[PDB]
Amino acid sequence: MESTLGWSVQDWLSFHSKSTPTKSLELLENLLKSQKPAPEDPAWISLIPVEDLHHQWNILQSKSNKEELPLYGVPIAVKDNIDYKGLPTTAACPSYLYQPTRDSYVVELLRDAGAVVIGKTNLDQFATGLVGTRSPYGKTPCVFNDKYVSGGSSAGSASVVGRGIVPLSLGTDTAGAGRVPAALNNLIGLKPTKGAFSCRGVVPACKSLDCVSVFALNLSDAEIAFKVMNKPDLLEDEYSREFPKNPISQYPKDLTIAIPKEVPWFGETENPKLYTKAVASLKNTGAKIVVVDFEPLLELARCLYEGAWVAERYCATRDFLATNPPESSLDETVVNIIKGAVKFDAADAFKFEYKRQGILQKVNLLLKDIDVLCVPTCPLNPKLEEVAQEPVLVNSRQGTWTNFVNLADLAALAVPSGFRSDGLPNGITLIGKKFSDYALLDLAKRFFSVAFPNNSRTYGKFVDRRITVEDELDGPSKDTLNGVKLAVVGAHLKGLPLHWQLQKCNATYLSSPKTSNNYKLYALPKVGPVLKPGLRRVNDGTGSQIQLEVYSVPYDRFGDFIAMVPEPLGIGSVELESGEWVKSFICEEFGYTQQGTVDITKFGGFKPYIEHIQ
Amino acid sequence: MESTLGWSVQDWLSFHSKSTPTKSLELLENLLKSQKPAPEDPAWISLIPVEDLHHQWNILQSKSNKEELPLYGVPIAVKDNIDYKGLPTTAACPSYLYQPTRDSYVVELLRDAGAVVIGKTNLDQFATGLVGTRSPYGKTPCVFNDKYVSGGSSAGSASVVGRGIVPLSLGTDTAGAGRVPAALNNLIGLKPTKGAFSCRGVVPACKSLDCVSVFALNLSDAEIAFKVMNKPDLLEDEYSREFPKNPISQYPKDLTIAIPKEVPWFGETENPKLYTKAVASLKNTGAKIVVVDFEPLLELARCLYEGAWVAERYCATRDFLATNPPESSLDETVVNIIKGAVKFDAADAFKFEYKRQGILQKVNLLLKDIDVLCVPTCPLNPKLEEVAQEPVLVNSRQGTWTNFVNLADLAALAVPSGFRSDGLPNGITLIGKKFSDYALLDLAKRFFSVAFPNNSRTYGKFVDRRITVEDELDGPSKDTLNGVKLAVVGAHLKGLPLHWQLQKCNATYLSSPKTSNNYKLYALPKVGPVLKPGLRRVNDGTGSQIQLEVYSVPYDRFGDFIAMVPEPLGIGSVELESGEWVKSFICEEFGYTQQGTVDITKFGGFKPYIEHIQ
């Protein structure tokens, strides 16, 4: 009838828009029928019954402003880690199987945004691994080549978006499980700033470090997902934390990107090529690339390995393990790992925590200079064979670049970097300070325009298709501003010499209105190398309207900005064509009174004027 | 010659400034000699031998700013918990004795600022207790009466400062040891924001909760000590953290002060009479007292008794106990409290941390609303023999207000509230948010001037002496500032109706310059109930000089300020008498052109014209 495989969020929406509440249930009805559970498709642990689909779809029908839910009837998958009321939760352990009577906060949000859950996706037992092989439900393969591992622990979620069954899936990520699988499947892996997404209704692994995460095929959809799940939840998740107002949206073009001085590849020879390339590619966005000694960070990861954090896993599972459940239910590697906790007492937990904080001091000194870390997502693309032969060594290696991110409270975005000779994908992860998530998205779009020029970027398994438009970003929503509505008229307008002064203060554009009928404009005598105007409210009726640009300037930032404003300009209030009043550039009478003040009200705004003695 | 007993820091300083080095030294020697170690004075574990005094004195004399040193030649004591290189550190356990190479940073900062260490003071063993009695070296009495307990664990430090022996002492505070001994000895106990004062070179107890603290006879001395010790030490104390720029120096006159709904006294009859009177004096300062459910805070405190924090003590101390050490050198209650930690898995420790985090989510919501908490410092004035009956009960009742402050990351100040009919002191601890230390000191001063009207405040044992000038405050020094220099000319002046807007944005007064003679001042048409002026710069030589006050407004808070500036005023710039420019209130043309404007230039400033107009 049609083919859904590889449809973006947008694709799915526009279909549903020009189609009907039965014909678009048809498409979902048999997308669901085309899927297999169990051992037959190792990617899916359970699928929704056909009747559950109907039920979700009914509720989607009560919703009254349908063509506004940013995710209306978009199918999605969820690590069998994260509760959904419709299906059981397992954590890739058949005997751990419980039924939640309530959605995950995060599922609940996406359902409210109009999404349809399709089934619980397969993971490394108890989210413990970066391979994707450590599950009794089966070994999920890389979407490109069945000799190859999918990555873990979010194995099924990466696989199912990778072959485009679904445009979005959820994973979790403590130490790489939402990053490593992006690389191996040519996907986008967003590891949100910690605490931004709630973990209510997700089974605890390392609670104090855990994050729900998202796989998509493009920046576009990753953003949509992130906007929908970045929601507080304080009283029901002990590690939730509200995002601040005025989140940055875009780094400066010459932002500082650190790359590591020592890069271990462990024998790999293809992956270093793609990395080297990626860096050069950043250089040509105009980023300042600086080579940094990552020792403190690798010190921080050695904590995770030597410390008692394993005991978090133990804390979460020890009652169940005392149940002494059937052995064919447990992955021995996972169980063994988790029981390492027994050797650590309360005092050791603290001793290691002291060490964690010590290293954080160093780590915080390093990051103060730097905006973004660029890191290979992972050294290897392991074969199923290699991890069977080395079930541990391979796992550690895949943890090289991912382990420190959560312990240092950073945000990260795993993004594709091209293809090795053998036709398999790898990538880089961009790591930013907390709350930088929209800016990471933005920086990735900027890296894509260089590294896959024109529109050559590929997605998931679809090596023969091209992103045109699906890597575009909304940026943060208006909901998130809390600034001063300030109007500009001169050097601060788009393109004019001082518009940077607005960007340095993460000013956000609002609109281009005109002043009311009350105003006059003047070129003041050129002192510096920039020519500047100067508004004037004068009411002997003789005033027309001047062309304005209005920007929200974040409250905590306005000082930074007004420090740059010299005599005889200032910030007062100008009345708009709207009758509304708004903070704005004004001028001491003195300024427009000097010799060589040209009246410029004639020309409508400052724009025309500064181009005709030009 | 005269008696040193009860001398302020300033007493010490003005003697040295009017005396010869030799004569000063004599006074220090005499002082030193009049002291007796333990057991004959239970307060002192060790005194410096005369040759260390000389050695200290000499290092002082080597300095070429010696007079400009805020603590020049002031004697101080330090808890036998805190390293001074000239004496042994004990933690009040004879067999723990060791002899440090270097000073603890905090003592090193005191020394650099001129302090002379006279000796190490007695504590509850390993700083475990709120009573002062858990010590092999002796049971230190309340400086007011022999049959009463000094309070712990900083027991010595409160004795010597209470007896006017030394104007400043160092203690530590995990769950009340900097606070309870102040209430009980009529002292000021400053417990700073976590991480403000370094913990390098102090023996850990609950390392993730430890603060070094300060006792003093008066606010002024506490502030001075604070300013010297509040310095970052990130690379050598993994819990050290720098104060940000622009710390608040004063709460608004009408700040919110929370008190508890339910206030347990455990059969105390005297103490509640003091607490109620303290509450009333604070109502009398203009404060808004709110009755708050303290349940969440009390949940956090019983997190510490029930939880695995006691394992931090074990952590600090297990190697030492393994070396099966002499029985007689140990306090059995103490070692039992500590050995109680072996019950706890790493995984239990995390479980308790999850809970702690959950309670904090509730605490931080409860507190956003509030500026300060007012709490009885401690319910009881325990007698020595009451403690010998109840070596555990009394301890924990004394903990009913102290146990949540550090777990929640708060600042605190234990301050005196008067005397119970039987002649004993108690008081009030004021609890503020992180980095609020300066404003807490100022609030205490405000409290005093109502609680102890026309200079009738007592200090230490000195029931017959009167605080004249020593509770006065410098506020934070100017190098803590980072703001926009802003001139005001009108209703924002000191004493005028809109001045509150500068305090509410945490503005700091700089000075009172005039403009250059290029200025006119106008009283704008009275519209609201608040009259307003406007500056006009004019070139034509017809200007004059107008009074201003110039403030520093944190860059941080300037948006909040400008947001309250309406049409026709603005913020631009003023040239000062000095030729310097400086942000200033300015005014639209349209402002001083309106029907009803008065030229007010002849008055040389807004204030003279308001008083004339009356």
3-state secondary structure of B487: strand
The CA distances from residue B139 to A92, B160, B430, in Å, are 61, 14, 28
DSSP secondary structure, A478-517, as one string: GGG--EEEEEE-STTSTTSTTTHHHHTTT-EEEE--BB-S
> Cβ contact (<8 Å) for B589 and A589?
yes
- The label of the residue with tokens 């599950």 reads A135
Residues of chain A with Cβ-Cβ distance to B209 below 8 Å are none
The CA distances from residue A565 to A91, A502, A562, in Å, are 58, 12, 5
Q: A89 to chain B nearest CA, in Å?
A: 22
Q: Which of B9, B28, B54, B170 is nearest to B105 (CA)?
A: B170
Handedness of CA B20, B22, B26, B28 (dihedral sign): positive
Residues of chain A with Cβ-Cβ distance to B318 below 8 Å are 347
Rounded-to-integer distance, Cα A77 and Cα A48, Å = 10
Please return the burial class of B349, using the count of CB atoms within 10 Å of its CB with bins 0-12, 13-18 and 19+. Answer: buried
Q: A298 to chain B nearest CA, in Å?
A: 17
Q: Which two tokens stand for residue A258?
A: 């650190």
Can you list the positions of beta strands (E) in B154-219?
Answer: 168-173, 188-191, 211-216
Q: What is the helix, strand, coil percentage profile of chain B, to 5?
A: 35, 20, 45
Rounded-to-integer distance, Cα A214 and Cα A187, Å = 10
Residues of chain B with Cβ-Cβ distance to A484 below 8 Å are 559, 562-563
Rounded-to-integer distance, Cα A420 and Cα B4, Å = 82
Which residue in chain B has the smallest CA separation from A359? B238
Q: Which two tokens stand for residue B510?
A: 């700089």
Walk across the sheet containing B508-511 and list its strands.
A508-511, A549-554, A483-488, A581-587, A569-575, B569-575, B581-587, B483-488, B549-554, B508-511
> Cβ contact (<8 Å) for A556 and B556?
yes
3-state secondary structure of A525: coil
Q: Which of A183, A186, A192 is nearest to A399 (CA)?
A: A183
> Cβ contact (<8 Å) for A559 and B559?
yes
Q: Which two tokens stand for residue B77?
A: 């004591």
Residue A450 near residue A285 (C-beta atoms within 8 A): yes
Handedness of CA B43, B49, B50, B51 (dihedral sign): negative
> Cβ contact (<8 Å) for B590 and A357?
no
Neighbouring C-beta atoms of residue A220, cutoff 10 Å: 23
Residue B491 near residue B587 (C-beta atoms within 8 A): no
Can you list the positions of beta strands (E) in A4-93?
Answer: 74-79
Neighbouring C-beta atoms of residue B472, cutoff 10 Å: 12
Q: Which two tokens stand for residue B348?
A: 């239990």
Beta bridge partners of B605: none
Query: B220: number of CA atoms within 13 Å, CB side?
Result: 16
Residue A86 near residue A117 (C-beta atoms within 8 A): yes
Residue of A198, A208, A315 to mutate, interface with B, max B Cβ within 10 Å: A315
Residue A202 near residue A172 (C-beta atoms within 8 A): yes
Rounded-to-integer distance, Cα A359 and Cα A303, Å = 9
Q: B400 to chain A nearest CA, in Å?
A: 25
> Cβ contact (<8 Å) for A365 and B572?
no
Instruction: Count chain A–chain B contacts defined by CB atoms under 8 A.
Output: 193
Residues of chain A with Cβ-Cβ distance to B342 below 8 Å are 345
3-state secondary structure of B65: coil
Rounded-to-integer distance, Cα A509 and Cα A493, Å = 10
> Cβ contact (<8 Å) for B572 and A586?
yes
- The label of the residue with tokens 């160092």 reads B170
> Cβ contact (<8 Å) for B559 and A558?
yes
Q: Which two tokens stand for residue B2?
A: 């005269």
Which of B344, B558, B565 lies nearest to residue A345, judging by beta carbons?
A: B344
Q: B198 to chain A nearest CA, in Å?
A: 13
Neighbouring C-beta atoms of residue B342, cutoff 10 Å: 13
**B168-173 and B75-79: which strand pairing?**
parallel
Q: Which residues contact A345 (CB under 8 A, 6 or more apart)?
A: B311, B342, B344, B345, B346
Q: B344 to chain A nearest CA, in Å?
A: 5
Q: Which residues contact A406 (CB under 8 A, 6 or more apart)?
A: A173, A174, A175, A194, A209, A210, A211
Residue A96 near residue A190 (C-beta atoms within 8 A): no
Handedness of CA A199, A203, A208, A212 (dihedral sign): negative
Neighbouring C-beta atoms of residue B244, cutoff 10 Å: 12
Rounded-to-integer distance, Cα B208 and Cα B407, Å = 9
The CA distances from residue B481 to B151, B179, B484, B485, B597, in Å, are 38, 30, 10, 11, 38
The CA distances from residue B427 to B187, B188, B273, B588, in Å, are 9, 10, 11, 54
Residue A239 near residue A194 (C-beta atoms within 8 A): yes
Q: Which two tokens stand for residue B319?
A: 């190697």
Residue-level length of chain B: 614
Which of A207, A238, A562 lies nearest to residue B361, judging by beta carbons?
A: A238
Q: Which two tokens stand for residue A12?
A: 């799915």
- φ/ψ of B585, rounded to 5, equals -55, 130
Q: Which two tokens stand for residue B214?
A: 């300060």
Which residue in chain B has the smallest CA separation from A573? B567
Beta bridge partners of B76: B117, B168
Please return the burial class of A208, using the count of CB atoms within 10 Å of its CB with bins 0-12, 13-18 and 19+. Answer: middle
Distance from the Cα of residue A613 to its chain's centroid: 46
Peptide bond into B568 cis (omega under 30): yes
Neighbouring C-beta atoms of residue B333, cutoff 10 Å: 18
3-state secondary structure of A585: strand
Which residue in chain B has the smallest CA separation from A360? B238
Resolution (Å) of this entry? 2.6
Q: Which of A194, A157, A148 is nearest to A177 (CA)?
A: A157
The CA distances from residue B293 to A508, B362, B434, in Å, are 41, 12, 21
Neighbouring C-beta atoms of residue A94, cutoff 10 Å: 17
Residues of chain A with Cβ-Cβ distance to B200 below 8 Å are none
**B116-121 and B75-79: which strand pairing?**
parallel
Q: Which two tokens stand for residue B249?
A: 């120096």
DSSP secondary structure, A228-276, as one string: HH----TTT-TT--PPPSS------TT-EEEEES----TT--SHHHHHH
Rounded-to-integer distance, Cα A27 and Cα A72, Å = 14
Q: Which of A133, A172, A131 is nearest to A152 (CA)?
A: A131
Residues of chain B with Cβ-Cβ distance to A539 below 8 Å are 590
H or E element at residue B50 = helix B50-61
> Cβ contact (<8 Å) for B238 and A358?
yes
> Cβ contact (<8 Å) for A560 and B555?
yes
**A549-554 and A508-511: which strand pairing?**
antiparallel
Residue A509 near residue A272 (C-beta atoms within 8 A): no
DSSP secondary structure, B509-546, as one string: EEE--BB-S-EEEEEPPP-SSS--EEEEE-SSS--B--
Runs of H (alpha helix) within B124-175:
155-162
Which residue in chain A has the smallest CA separation from B357? A238
Rounded-to-integer distance, Cα A221 and Cα A215, Å = 9
Q: Which residues of A221-242 are buried (b: 16+ CB within 10 A; e: fewer)?
A: bbbbbbbbbbbebbeebbbbbe
Judged by phi (left if over 0) then psi (alpha if -120 to 50, else beta), residue A209 lies in alpha
Residue A148 near residue A138 (C-beta atoms within 8 A): no
Residue A266 near residue A379 (C-beta atoms within 8 A): yes
- φ/ψ of B554, rounded to 5, equals -50, 140
Please return the burial class of B502, using the count of CB atoms within 10 Å of its CB with bins 0-12, 13-18 and 19+. Answer: buried
Residue A603 near residue A609 (C-beta atoms within 8 A): yes
Residue of A362, A520, A588 to mutate, interface with B, max B Cβ within 10 Å: A588
Rounded-to-integer distance, Cα A172 and Cα A182, Å = 12
Residue A380 near residue A266 (C-beta atoms within 8 A): yes
> Cβ contact (<8 Å) for A559 and B563?
no
Residues of chain A with Cβ-Cβ distance to B174 below 8 Å are none
Q: What is the helix, strand, coil percentage profile of chain A, to 5?
A: 35, 20, 45
Residues of chain B with Cβ-Cβ distance to A348 below 8 Å are 346
- φ/ψ of A363, rounded to 5, equals -55, -50
Rounded-to-integer distance, Cα A441 and Cα A192, Å = 11
Rounded-to-integer distance, Cα B468 and Cα B582, Å = 39
Handedness of CA B497, B502, B506, B510 (dihedral sign): negative
> Cβ contact (<8 Å) for B342 and A344?
no
**A74-79 and A115-121: which strand pairing?**
parallel
Residue A111 near residue A103 (C-beta atoms within 8 A): yes
Q: Which residues contact A328 (CB under 8 A, 6 or more apart)?
A: A136
> Cβ contact (<8 Å) for B238 and A361?
yes
- φ/ψ of A418, rounded to 5, equals 125, -160
> Cβ contact (<8 Å) for A341 and B353?
no
- The conformation of residue B452, written as its DSSP 8-state character, comes to S
> Cβ contact (<8 Å) for A311 and B589?
no
Q: B289 to chain A nearest CA, in Å?
A: 27
Walk across the sheet containing A256-260 and list its strands.
A115-121, A74-79, A168-173, A211-216, A188-191, A411-419, A425-432, A372-376, A256-260, A288-292
Residue B268 near residue B260 (C-beta atoms within 8 A): no
3-state secondary structure of B176: coil
Residues of chain A with Cβ-Cβ distance to B583 below 8 Å are 562-563
Which of B351, B483, B571 lies nearest to residue A571, judging by beta carbons?
A: B571
- Kindly tell me the number of DSSP H helices and DSSP E strands found in chain A: 19, 18
Neighbouring C-beta atoms of residue B507, cutoff 10 Å: 24
Please, what are the domains in chain B?
1-294+371-477 (3.90.1300.10), 295-370 (1.20.58.1700), 478-614 (3.10.490.10)
Which residue in chain A has the smallest CA separation from B237? A358
Residues of chain B with Cβ-Cβ distance to A581 below 8 Å are 567
H or E element at residue B599 = strand B598-599
CA end-to-end span of chain A: 60
Rounded-to-integer distance, Cα B251 and Cα B506, Å = 9
- Three-state secondary structure readout of B243-299: CCCCCCCCCCCCCEEEEECCCCCCCCCCHHHHHHHHHHHHHCCCCEEEEECCHHHHH
Using only C-alpha atoms, chain B has a radius of gyration, in whole angstroms, of 27
Which residue in chain A has the smallest CA separation from B359? A238
Beta bridge partners of B519: B537, B544
Rounded-to-integer distance, Cα A24 and Cα A4, Å = 12
> Cβ contact (<8 Å) for A357 and B308?
no
Q: Which two tokens stand for residue A561?
A: 């900005």
Q: Which of B488, B482, B494 is nearest to B564 (CA)?
A: B488
Rounded-to-integer distance, Cα B196 and Cα A576, Å = 49
DSSP secondary structure, A301-351, as one string: HHHHHHSSTHHHHHHHHHHHHHT---GGGS-HHHHHHHHGGGG-BHHHHHH
Please return the burial class of B602, using the count of CB atoms within 10 Å of its CB with bins 0-12, 13-18 and 19+. Answer: exposed
Q: Which two tokens stand for residue B455?
A: 């200079």
**A425-432 and A411-419: which strand pairing?**
antiparallel
- The label of the residue with tokens 């307060």 reads B43
**A598-599 and A519-523: which strand pairing?**
antiparallel
Residue A246 one-letter amino acid:
N
Rounded-to-integer distance, Cα A546 and Cα A576, Å = 9
Rounded-to-integer distance, Cα B191 and Cα B492, Å = 35
Handedness of CA B63, B68, B74, B80 (dihedral sign): negative
> Cβ contact (<8 Å) for B589 and A240?
no
Q: At what angle do helices A219-229 and A437-451 cross, to 10 degrees?
A: 180
Q: Which two tokens stand for residue A73?
A: 């009837």
- The conformation of residue A92, written as its DSSP 8-state character, comes to T
Residue A486 near residue A560 (C-beta atoms within 8 A): no
Rounded-to-integer distance, Cα A55 and Cα B523, Å = 70
> Cβ contact (<8 Å) for A234 and B365?
yes
Residue B178 near residue B81 (C-beta atoms within 8 A): no
Solved using: X-ray
Rounded-to-integer distance, Cα A81 and Cα A171, Å = 8
Please return the burial class of A288, using the count of CB atoms within 10 Å of its CB with bins 0-12, 13-18 and 19+. Answer: middle
For Cα atoms B596, B599, B600, give the angle at the middle one, nearest 5 degrees. Answer: 120
